[PDB]
RNA sequence: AAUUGAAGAGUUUGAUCAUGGCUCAGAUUGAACGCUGGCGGCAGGCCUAACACAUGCAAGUCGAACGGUAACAGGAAGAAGC
């Protein structure tokens, strides 16, 4: 029900004085299909260790979205570090089309249709925070129209 | 009811980020090669040497234009081995 996903696991060196002290590194989303969409990287010298910091870390600071039916009301661009993302409405076409840790954390959002492409350096950490740097700053109609006395 | 619309992955380093190029996952062709190979429908078949060509054929028709008859179906002008 909490739809947690992983999505990369990478190991780090330390480089000691008597060697080198290999530990692991995760990335872990999690999310329901209604909003509420959270992360977490986590660290350990074990990758399960690692795996259920980074799960128990996203359970936190979990942020809710905006979402329409099925998809956002208006294209988006996020930016970051170093990784860009474009985010379009895209309705029906009975899918969504993103790739490698983007398509996870919109199928953990719950957002079936959306039309998601990366621009730029394909950290999976980055373009995770890109993603949900520019579905934080997405904002829903009603919100923009209780702001600007909507008239419609 | 007549463009509703987009995937990434590996690689610099003891590990990180970015820049940056390299490689791969798709279609597609007048395709060639290796292996294999049953049938049918449709389409295609000198991209290179506008290099050179044996041979055969691809533009003749009209006698209702004409002088003509080499023909010859020759009835028929004539004759007959009858």
Known sequence: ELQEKLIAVNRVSKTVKGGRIFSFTALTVVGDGNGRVGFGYGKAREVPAAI???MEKARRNMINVALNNGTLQHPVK???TGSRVFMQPASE???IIAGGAMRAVLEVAGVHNVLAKAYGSTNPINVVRATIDGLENMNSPE???AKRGKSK
């Open 52 to 54: 259920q910091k980074a």
């Open 78 to 80: 996020g930016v970051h």
């Open 93 to 95: 076409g009975t899918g």
């Open 143 to 145: 919100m923009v129209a």
